[PDB]
Subunit: 346 residues, 5 copies
């Protein structure tokens, strides 16, 4: 017989197969085994708190109404246009904001029925999945994106999802991200839902993303530190050259301001304080204080010999005090942002 | 009987069920009970005056044409492909700008018919809902987004919507927003429409959003205040050092200008005046006035002893007068923007 | 009879109703009465020269093939899935760039057939409509957006559109725009098309939009004016302090430049000259000329007593001449842009 | 007979009309006459090298299988839902990147069959058409956008396209563009394709666009020229005032830099050199050279009377030499960009 | 016979053709020959790591069930609406993120059946294909975009893809890119997939893109070099003029900062270090070090004849040492970025 006419006999009207009735309709629940292959991963966006993925989803279950022994071939293949003639699980992605299937050329779907009634069902689809991001430690933040597979209308006494044991989630080689770095280790969890209706099956996977810091180091942190160092050279300039020390102080404040305002187009638009904002505020307070120090030296120095040496003492104290307090701030900043804040205990 | 063939008998041609006729067609109106579960909430945009939501919508009503007692099961389940065989309310979202259903895997829909004829109908859908925003008190503004559920073509003697009594609107845990903060308290109101055609049912929910201020404090308000303070140190510099006091005055004006123009890429594009614009204008008038004060001191001081002390008196008066009037402005600014303007009386 | 089976008798095959034949097929033209209710209005974009609207469109006409007297109910309701069984006008929006209907929940459509054969047809739809904008007087410009309703394939001896007499165009309360302000008065016009094929019916509505000026006043015009005033204080500084007057002149030019370049991210991207560009160019010519005045004073003053007083005379003349010519420019600018240019004569 | 039942007799099963067979199937090719009416024109984008159009497309040909004489009416009208019952040319736009039809209200389509068998077929559609743009002479560039109408699967012995003789391409009145200006003169060409399969018909139209220069003149070219002029006033300042001439030179370089970097957000993002980039680089080399001239004057002047006058001679030579070489550069720049480069020889 | 009725006899129910069974169902695999014609190429985006293409795809294979000799014509043409009546390969693009067909006018598809049973199948489609980009050598980077054609559900003993021998991949003339330059040479490779299911056929093509450097040379590298040169003229200024050398040093640092921050809006947003970032950091370290040199000269020079000449020696050494070390840096920079890094060995 042609492999198709055998399918029309297996899921036939004379056979009485009903695609709206689950396998083992009265007995134990259906056990669906799931795989994910991630083809692409990106478009991670803080404005919408989501990311975009392109996956192969494979589901495997057993349907005893589809067992056959008379046909010699040990596997049959359903046409993708006849997919509504067979029962399929009602899997949906719980944190999905948008999805579509792929129909370029032939529909990107595949269904294979085995001799014992096992069904293999593999589809290709694009997802936009939501992920809440924190950003409090922004240059040095670690994010966790999840992906939850849930049944829409079957409780856990009719339908149960499980991950594959060998490789349930795989990622294609050679994927890059402009901002993040996808780690190799992934969690497979149960996130079983308890509602008023009953207990609904749900499995999830967690991906860990670490932001790279090299660009922010070379473009924001180090230029701000050089501007802070440049504000300290006023303390070695002679206190009589007021146009020199005042113009150096205020141009250092202006350079600090153009550095902040120019860095303001390439940062995430949030409303709370980030760690780079703390750094940029302390560097501005440092260049503001170096100009107030000269305002005090210039005012104390003109009160007409005891007054000349008190003003020179303010300069010699500021020569050691400004770099020391800036080293203490750097120690507490990098310690509390690279040791005292790790959120991957999972 | 298979649960499906029983459905084909209940809504059968021999039964004479008509999906275009409401339940209790001659008698009292249909009472629909509604729930909302908000899965995601975001994309709040001032350019388009809208926000994006992803919800579960559940409707419950009674259809006496669907009551059955012969079948043992106390609940039946309609296939999502047979949903046009049953009557459903014509609910629409009155402030919707765009919407779609979810068909990833199986259609994200569910209909359950009980023994007494009660119908439970649960769908998943994405909305873009309009919300007019004010922005007059922008760093410190509070917004209210609503969501109106209305019948399209039935008056209130045929169809009535009501919220559930226990939990009509719930929000998923762990949702974050980049700019706002969704409050926990929600209003459930009637917004019944009165038209020429008659009285149309309509229920709504109000969400309250408060903008976070910490980033605007650390990046806009405090640097402007430091620049204003830096403009006051001219009054303690000797009045003979004209290149020092003129260059400090005009570089303080330039720093104020680069601070404003750099803050100009991360603010909402509206055409009216915001509170941050008031603050930025007053700080510019303060650094403009400190340079006019030196122009007066420098001009009065050269008129050739009575003229030297009048110019020194302008400096000693400005030393107390500029910080005092700036403290008075700060008191009236933060009082009228954090006490005299609350719009959540609802 | 069930209200549906009566519809299947009225537009029946035995009745011989043909949905492809207009009412009064041989006689006088069909008269369609139109209403518009505007739910939302926004997304006004100069880059694409269009705006976005969300309306209810209601059409009313008479079909004598649909008159019935045997049924007791004085109004019937066609199902939105049976809308291709009835004749409808082929209304299209002549300046539409994009459109779609709304199918969230049930299709957002409604058709009501009365006893005398009158049809009421109400649909909800989203439009993107084109509008050419001028922008020559940009901070102070007034725009006119139109909306044209035309028949696609019927001449004015078959189909005629008319506005309702009581309220053909209404707008929902509480709509805001980020940049514009929609006026209350609307024009209802005929814009009848004359083609080679014949005379085609077409009605239109005009909306008037006025841009708000308060933000541009507080952020662009007033800071530029303060910078121009700051360039005049060089004339009161002693002519011997060349580092003071040269540094004040060139830093005033730099402040004028950072003010222009920072305002350059929030303006519409056109290729012709706007009124704000005229203002920004004249303020730059004013701060350029104040520095050329000192270059002349400094050069004339050193030619070695007659030369000292000629240079002092240039300063005393510039003290009155620069503010006077700037007041004359302000008078001609605001007069020709707020009196001599009104384009709402309509 | 009803005009429809006559259509069902003309294209009937008893008539044996086949919509998959072209008219004159064995004989001479079909001659299709084409018109274009452009409703809107815009969204010209250098990032994607495309533009957007909204047109009416009208095709006219003769089908002798559709000739009829028994019916009194000299024109019939096919319903837009029955359009697959008739043969139509397989016209496609060869440089299209995206297209869609308009289905707001009734489908925006129209087909009219005459007595002699002539068919008039008019549709409304939106196109995104590709256009390669050059941008080497960017402020002063002229672009040419084309629009090619080709048959997909018929060689020129089956199907031939021709433009109408009276008005094949018309544009609606009152269209504006933010950046360009659409000229009135249009080319109608043949662009016949020669492939391995055979000779395929193809007609095209060329539109000419000229960029407006007024905004770039008032905002980029003239401020740069004023900054260059301001760098020349150092040559008239006394050579002993080193803080004045050094601060004026470096602040002029900084003003030139903020002028360039602020103009950097409103220019097209390409990777090759534009004419404005040439202008901005030469103006920077001019303000760089004026500061090197003072570095030479200041160094030569202190070598301890012969040295004082050699340094004064460098100043007096630079007073005439810098404006002269800048006038020569302006003459060669505007001559080679407004005379020696015209690309509309077509 | 009409060419259609012959098709209905060839793929007839009496013929028993089954479109779900491949040709040579029991025997050797089907050999499909593929061509690509690229109509447009662009939208290369680093944020999403993808590019957009518009191609003609042509597939050729042999179907012995479609051989016919009775008909005189040596080629038949299937209607695009009957394409599901014939077997077609299940080609899909393995790195596709989005795709669609073109249905403007008639569907842009074509199928031709020859006498011996050869099938030619040509479709037009738009692709968004993923490409990982590196950007470590960003101004001077070379990218490689691929395009993989794979069978979805057939192993290599049923279906085999091959490129054409004469011209499998062609590109239309006159395509331009805003940033890149598409090379003429293309690789044709096998990328055969080995899975658990078996061996799946897959062919690919590689395109090579080189970024143009002229704009980055004239706008970023050369202005930074002029600012570095301007920082060296302090060494030729007299060491007693402290306001001149301090103001020149700090204004050179500020100019370097506005140059970097203004270049910060037109660069790709990645998180790692690019070569332009290395260049911009070294130029900032050079202008920072020239100001530290004067801070040392000014401090050493005032310690009260031995001290005057040690400070003059620091100036005379810095006059030769700063340009030399900057020439060494330029030599190592351009050598390691234009010789030691070529990645087109392929
Ligand atoms: C799906 O898997 C579950 C769990 O593995 C199966 O439930 C078990 O079935 C065995 C039958 O041998 C019982 O002994 C266990 O007590 C069951 N466990 C639970 C928790 O119910 C279930 O039978 C499987 N379904 C099918 C159709 O095979
Ligand atoms: C829907 O709810 C309304 C209001 O609860 C019901 O209307 C009431 O019906 C009771 C019947 O016992 C009357 O006594 C009341 O006077 C009615 N109130 C009003 C305001 O009409 C209505 O019957 C319900 N519909 C159905 C189908 O049960
Ligand atoms: C549609 O309206 C037009 C104009 O009101 C009607 O045309 C008029 O019909 C009356 C019939 O009493 C004539 O006396 C007028 O001379 C007509 N005017 C014109 C300009 O033709 C038309 O009859 C209406 N159509 C229908 C179906 O009622
Ligand atoms: C379509 O137009 C072409 C060209 O005008 C016609 O081809 C000509 O037909 C006339 C018949 O009187 C011949 O004398 C010419 O020699 C033909 N020219 C060419 C170049 O073939 C063609 O007949 C037209 N098609 C139809 C159906 O009328
Ligand atoms: C498709 O091409 C393959 C390879 O060219 C063909 O396989 C060969 O068939 C010949 C038959 O003459 C054998 O001699 C070779 O040994 C085969 N090679 C391999 C690697 O199998 C195959 O026959 C072709 N398919 C069809 C339908 O013609």
């Amino acid at each position: 017989m042609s492999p198709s006419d055998f399918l029309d006999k297996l899921m036939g009207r004379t056979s009485g197969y009903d695609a709206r009735i689950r396998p083992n309709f009265k007995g134990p629940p259906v056990n669906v085994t799931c795989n994910i292959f991630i083809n692409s991963f990106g478009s991670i966006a803080e404005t919408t708190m989501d990311y975009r993925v392109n996956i192969f989803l494979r589901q495997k279950w057993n349907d005893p109404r589809l067992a056959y022994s008379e046909y010699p071939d040990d596997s049959l293949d359903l046409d993708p246009s006849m997919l509504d003639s067979i029962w399929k699980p009602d899997l949906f992605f719980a944190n999905e904001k948008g999805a579509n299937f792929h129909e370029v050329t032939t529909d990107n779907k595949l269904l294979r029925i085995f001799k014992n009634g096992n069904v293999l069902y593999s589809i290709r689809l694009t997802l936009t999945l939501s992920c809440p991001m924190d950003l409090k430690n922004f240059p040095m933040d670690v994010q966790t994106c999840i992906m939850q597979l849930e049944s829409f209308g079957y409780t856990m006494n009719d339908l149960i999802f499980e991950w594959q044991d060998e490789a349930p989630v795989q990622v294609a080689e050679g994927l890059t991200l402009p901002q993040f770095l996808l780690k190799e280790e992934k969690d497979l969890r149960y996130c079983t839902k308890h509602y008023n209706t009953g207990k609904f099956t749900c499995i999830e996977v967690r991906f860990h993303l670490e932001r790279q810091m090299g660009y922010y180091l070379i473009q924001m942190y180090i230029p701000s530190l050089l501007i802070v160092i440049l504000s300290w050279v006023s303390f070695w300039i002679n206190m009589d050259a007021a146009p020199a020390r005042v113009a150096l102080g205020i141009t250092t404040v202006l350079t600090m301001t153009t550095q902040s305002s120019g860095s303001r187009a390439s940062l995430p638009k949030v409303s709370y304080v980030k760690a780079i904002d703390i750094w940029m505020a302390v560097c501005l307070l440092f260049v503001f204080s170096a100009l107030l120090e000269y305002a005090a030296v210039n005012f104390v120095s003109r009160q007409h010999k005891v007054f000349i040496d008190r003003a020179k003492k303010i300069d010699t104290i500021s020569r050691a005090c400004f770099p020391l307090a800036f080293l203490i701030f750097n120690i507490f900043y990098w310690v509390i942002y690279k040791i005292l804040r790790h959120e991957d205990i999972h």
